[PDB]
Amino acid sequence: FVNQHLCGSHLVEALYLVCGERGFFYTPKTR
Amino acid sequence: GIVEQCCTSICSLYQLENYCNG
């Protein structure tokens, strides 16, 4: 692994996959 | 907030974990 650029829906998809079966319980929004 | 910390600069798996908890 090496650190990478991620924006918007790709940053959400990556955080959801790294957070496994948890992720967000609600619909996602940029913050 | 959180999107800029991976979008305008690179981020890690440990940051992608933190963005699920924040």
Curated annotation (Swiss-Prot), chain A:
Mutagenesis / variant outcome for changing H10D: In HPRI; Providence
Protein name per Swiss-Prot or TrEMBL: Insulin B chain
Originating gene: INS
Residue range from the parent sequence: 25 to 55 of 110
